[PDB]
Structure 1
Amino acid sequence: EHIQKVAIFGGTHGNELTGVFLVKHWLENGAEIQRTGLEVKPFITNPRAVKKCTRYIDCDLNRIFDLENLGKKMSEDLPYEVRRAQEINHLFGPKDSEDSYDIIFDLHNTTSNMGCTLILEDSRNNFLIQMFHYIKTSLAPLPCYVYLIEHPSLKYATTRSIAKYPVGIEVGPQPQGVLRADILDQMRKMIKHALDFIHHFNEGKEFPPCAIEVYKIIEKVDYPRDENGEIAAIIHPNLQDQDWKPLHPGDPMFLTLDGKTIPLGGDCTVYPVFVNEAAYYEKKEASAKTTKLTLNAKSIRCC
């Protein structure tokens, strides 16, 4: 390949502050994210949401980088994030074109207890799978996990999907509208190793094949509800904070006030991720369920 244009996005969601805080400082001083032989542009994707310290103004930005929206006629009637998405496509894409950026990192926080998390959009992309393995390995003994969101119908159109090689970086648990120092330090390490990986690769380092554990989306699940549609039971204490860890069909999952336990059910184990993410109450996702599988990558090298 050889890797030319790399961006780092922060503030895709305005109330996930770690990225906004990093990105604002790197806009004032890029040293940390520069590598010799490699320019990297930091950028604030949703500045209006950042100012109102809110997830979004009109709709969720990280859901709408698709043809329906990016091809619409530009006007003032449109939702702000739609208007905004096109401006980003124009500056860092166009999506699906060779004139696009090569790599975009999109920075995020979650209220779920997920630790360092990388988000893989493509199960058979050797370059990204090698990146993630490098990062995992470099972070150790600190855990790092890979959420694979590829699905026939459930994959959503991300800010970073613009890029040839989209990457999502997600670090929790952190309350919305808060800057924790230990979370901050973790996003930074994550990024440090990713950029190290690119540099290495660009200087013609050869990577043997690798393999990684990832968690593949199967199904999102809502909180159980009323006939009024109000929440009837919450995340059971035993499932609280147990993102990534295996959940068997008899195991507790929800809890009513009364309080009776509602268990998992079905006839196979699953790995929950995004357990009790604040921003998903709105989307009716109390938890995602994943299967854990191992992916391989071929060798890769530059020129």
Structure 2
Amino acid sequence: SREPLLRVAVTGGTHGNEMCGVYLARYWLQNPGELQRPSFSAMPVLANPAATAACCRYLDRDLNRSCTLTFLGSTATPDDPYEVKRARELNQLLGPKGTGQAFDFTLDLHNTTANTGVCLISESNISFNLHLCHYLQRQNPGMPCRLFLYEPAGTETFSVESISKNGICLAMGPQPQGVLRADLFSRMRALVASILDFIELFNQGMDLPAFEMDIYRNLGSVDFPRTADGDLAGTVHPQLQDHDFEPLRPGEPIFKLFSGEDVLYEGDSIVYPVFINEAAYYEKHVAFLKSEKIRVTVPALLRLTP
């Protein structure tokens, strides 16, 4: 017995300077008709109102790192980070996280300065999320739509969409922070429409046959070359720059130092760098994430049991 997804949210402005989500959320709050389907209506939400008003990523702390049960469960004070306070409000709205009152699904919208194109980031290999990616791929022949599987190191999930029972992040790049490109705005807008379409089909009892697909699974990060003071001593090499999801073999160049030397990848295996040179990641000490490209088998999601 398939349970329909009836309480569905689309969050924009989780990071205040990521403009597609910001303006789609603002627009939908004024024009919700677009998020309505026969079986359900998705609720638009501006996730970080103060960061959005200020057009910056966050005020005190990254909102997308503030939604752990520890943060949500903590006893409020006045001296809490704004984003911690806002996380609690999203917990009331979309959760509480880990309980049966949580929303069925949260779609969280993101932009990156990296040349990722269309990427879905999933914190688990839940088969519904893989079918969703597959659906978007099929709906857009010739458009890459890649799934980046980013499982939490251990126990606690951190993100805005993790508040809901399930959720996914739709990330689109490249786009400078604080800039709204018409091309990415429209494309993101159409892909959200398609994601809602998919939830409707699901809700209507559509059978989703098992299938196989390539996904990219996180191996971990590589930091920028630094001085003994952790200041940049170089940046991403021109031959790596803008080459997200392309293979990176050992011995290939990954940085150019200001001194003019090349730094080479010293790994044992070919990997697939993603989120190469993202502005928000400098302070997280991440020049890029290494991923392994793996072919997974996705079980069927059928209305009835065969």
Shorter-chain TM-score bucket reads: over 0.9
Equivalent pair of 1:214/1:294 in contact (CA under 8 Å): yes
Q: Give the paired residue count.
A: 302
Q: 1:34 aligns with which of 26, 33, 36?
A: 36
Paired residue for 2:217? Answer: 216
What runs of 5+ residues in structure 2 fail to find an aligned partner? none
Q: After superposition, where does 1:240-251 map in structure 2 within 5 Å?
A: 240-251=241-252
Structure 1 residues 79 and 151: CA distance shift in structure 2, 3 A = closer
Q: 1:119 aligns with which of 115, 118, 121?
A: 121
Whether 2:138 is the aligned partner of 1:137: answer yes
Larger CA deviation: 237-246 vs 28-37:
28-37
Paired residue for 2:185? Answer: 184
Whether 2:194 is the aligned partner of 1:193: answer yes
1:190 offset after TM fit, Å?
1.7
Aligned to 1:295, the other structure's residue is in SS state strand
Larger CA deviation: 146-155 vs 105-114:
146-155
Equivalent pairs: percent with the same residue? 42
Whether 2:176 is the aligned partner of 1:175: answer yes
Structure 1 residues 220 and 153: CA distance shift in structure 2, 3 A = farther
- RMSD, aligned CA: 1.4
Matches of 1:77 and 1:231, distance apart in 2: 32
Matches of 2:88 and 2:4, distance apart in 1: 27
Aligned to 2:284, the other structure's residue is in SS state coil
Matches of 1:52 and 1:214, distance apart in 2: 36
State the TM-score, normalized to the length of structure 2.
Answer: 0.96
Q: 1:20 aligns with which of 22, 37, 51?
A: 22
Paired residue for 2:104? Answer: 102
1:34 offset after TM fit, Å?
1.2
Paired residue for 1:238? Answer: 239
Aligned to 1:27, the other structure's residue is in SS state helix
* Letter of the 1:163 counterpart: S
Matches of 1:189 and 1:294, distance apart in 2: 27
Equivalent pair of 2:108/2:169 in contact (CA under 8 Å): yes
1:199 offset after TM fit, Å?
0.6
Larger CA deviation: 143-152 vs 246-255:
143-152
Matches of 2:80 and 2:152, distance apart in 1: 29
* Letter of the 2:269 counterpart: C
Paired residue for 2:261? Answer: 260
1:258 offset after TM fit, Å?
3.1
* Letter of the 2:35 counterpart: I
1:159 offset after TM fit, Å?
0.3
1:12-58 Cα shifts (integer Å, max 9, x gaps): 00000110101111111112221122111000111000011110010
Equivalent pair of 1:211/1:297 in contact (CA under 8 Å): yes
Paired residue for 1:43? Answer: 45
Equivalent pair of 1:11/1:17 in contact (CA under 8 Å): yes
Matches of 2:136 and 2:272, distance apart in 1: 22
Larger CA deviation: 112-121 vs 185-194:
185-194
Aligned to 1:281, the other structure's residue is in SS state helix
Structure 1 residues 135 and 162: CA distance shift in structure 2, 3 A = same
* Letter of the 2:149 counterpart: L
State the TM-score, normalized to the length of structure 1.
Answer: 0.96
Paired residue for 1:203? Answer: 204
1:249 offset after TM fit, Å?
0.3
Matches of 1:49 and 1:258, distance apart in 2: 37
Paired residue for 1:288? Answer: 289
Equivalent pair of 2:208/2:300 in contact (CA under 8 Å): yes
Segments of 4+ in structure 1 off by > 3 A?
A: 151-156
Equivalent pair of 2:15/2:56 in contact (CA under 8 Å): yes
Paired residue for 2:277? Answer: 276
Larger CA deviation: 151-160 vs 54-63:
151-160
Matches of 1:62 and 1:31, distance apart in 2: 28
1:57-107 Cα shifts (integer Å, max 9, x gaps): 100000121121000112211111001100110011111112110010101
1:154 offset after TM fit, Å?
9.4
Equivalent pair of 1:151/1:217 in contact (CA under 8 Å): no
Structure 1 residues 155 and 93: CA distance shift in structure 2, 3 A = closer
Matches of 1:219 and 1:274, distance apart in 2: 12
Larger CA deviation: 184-193 vs 108-117:
184-193
Matches of 1:206 and 1:217, distance apart in 2: 30
Paired residue for 1:149? Answer: 150
Equivalent pair of 2:251/2:266 in contact (CA under 8 Å): yes
Aligned to 2:171, the other structure's residue is in SS state strand
Aligned to 2:201, the other structure's residue is in SS state helix
Larger CA deviation: 12-21 vs 202-211:
202-211
Matches of 1:238 and 1:110, distance apart in 2: 19
Matches of 2:191 and 2:259, distance apart in 1: 43
What runs of 5+ residues in structure 1 fail to find an aligned partner? none
